[PDB]
Structure prediction request, 338 residues.
Amino acid sequence: KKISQYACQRRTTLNNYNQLFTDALDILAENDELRENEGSCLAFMRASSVLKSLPFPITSMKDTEGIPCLGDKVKSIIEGIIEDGESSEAKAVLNDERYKSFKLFTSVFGVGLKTAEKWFRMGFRTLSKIQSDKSLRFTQMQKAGFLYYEDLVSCVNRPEAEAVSMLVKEAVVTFLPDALVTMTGGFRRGKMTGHDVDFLITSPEATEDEEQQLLHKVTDFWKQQGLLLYCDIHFQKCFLILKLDHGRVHSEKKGWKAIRVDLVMCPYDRRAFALLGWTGSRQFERDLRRYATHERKMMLDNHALYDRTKRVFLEAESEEEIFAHLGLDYIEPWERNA
Ligand SMILES: [Mg+2]
Ligand SMILES: [Zn+2]
Ligand SMILES: [Zn+2]
Ligand SMILES: [Zn+2]
Ligand SMILES: [Zn+2]
Ligand SMILES: [Zn+2]
Ligand SMILES: [Zn+2]
Ligand SMILES: [Zn+2]
Prediction:
């Protein structure tokens, strides 16, 4: 059976037989500025995505026959990796003078490409020099990023994500006893680590006002308890840093860890669309929307599914119903790691 050009028509599990190729493509897709080779970041992303779906490792150029999304530029990168196990193109990005600084600066919560670039052009190369500088001005997000750096740079693991889930559920149930709280993002796709923990909160009985007030109630409750380290409030959402007591963690192993937490509140009837959107991966979501537009003349996003031919919104109480409306075989969350 031929491999679809769409990630939403492939099953992509975390059992990647092509990590040598994918890690190089991901470096090239992530570093457009630092790159010296002709090719598009979209072409690198789609090629990395198809390779992730393969049930076998590429061991020769003949293995690439019949695989879509492998352009001439991508095939030269695959060729170079087969040749000695490394990509000269990815290696040039890794050896680029700005690369190390950009990775380092953007690893701070509140620091994006614009700020990383500003600091690099000022002559900064280390966080220690940035933090101790007397002339620099930091946003409140960056101050939290620097204060809790070590904890935030350690990625969150599953026992920690689950301990956060318990905290979220206890806070949410206090104000909305009928609320459904679902962990989304990478953890829902079977990942063992993450840079943060995402949740989708919905309530079958909440009014428009109760649902607007919930995130404010929960964050105030955490502030009173001394757990809120940072807070910033399409759907209503908040980006937080929570104080997690390691005594709440059920694992094999300061007494606390700073954890980045994202909370999304959605109306009950749109829960399936928000769940689908927040589960990801980013490439899976991109392909689902591209397939819906180009193959079905449908408009899909985190809030709804609209049929442009019938001029009607399509309702769904589950992700399964969305796939069915799209004429797609159902792809389980752990199979969406495109
Ligand atoms: Mg996440
Ligand atoms: Zn730039
Ligand atoms: Zn690009
Ligand atoms: Zn831990
Ligand atoms: Zn997130
Ligand atoms: Zn235990
Ligand atoms: Zn398009
Ligand atoms: Zn919308």
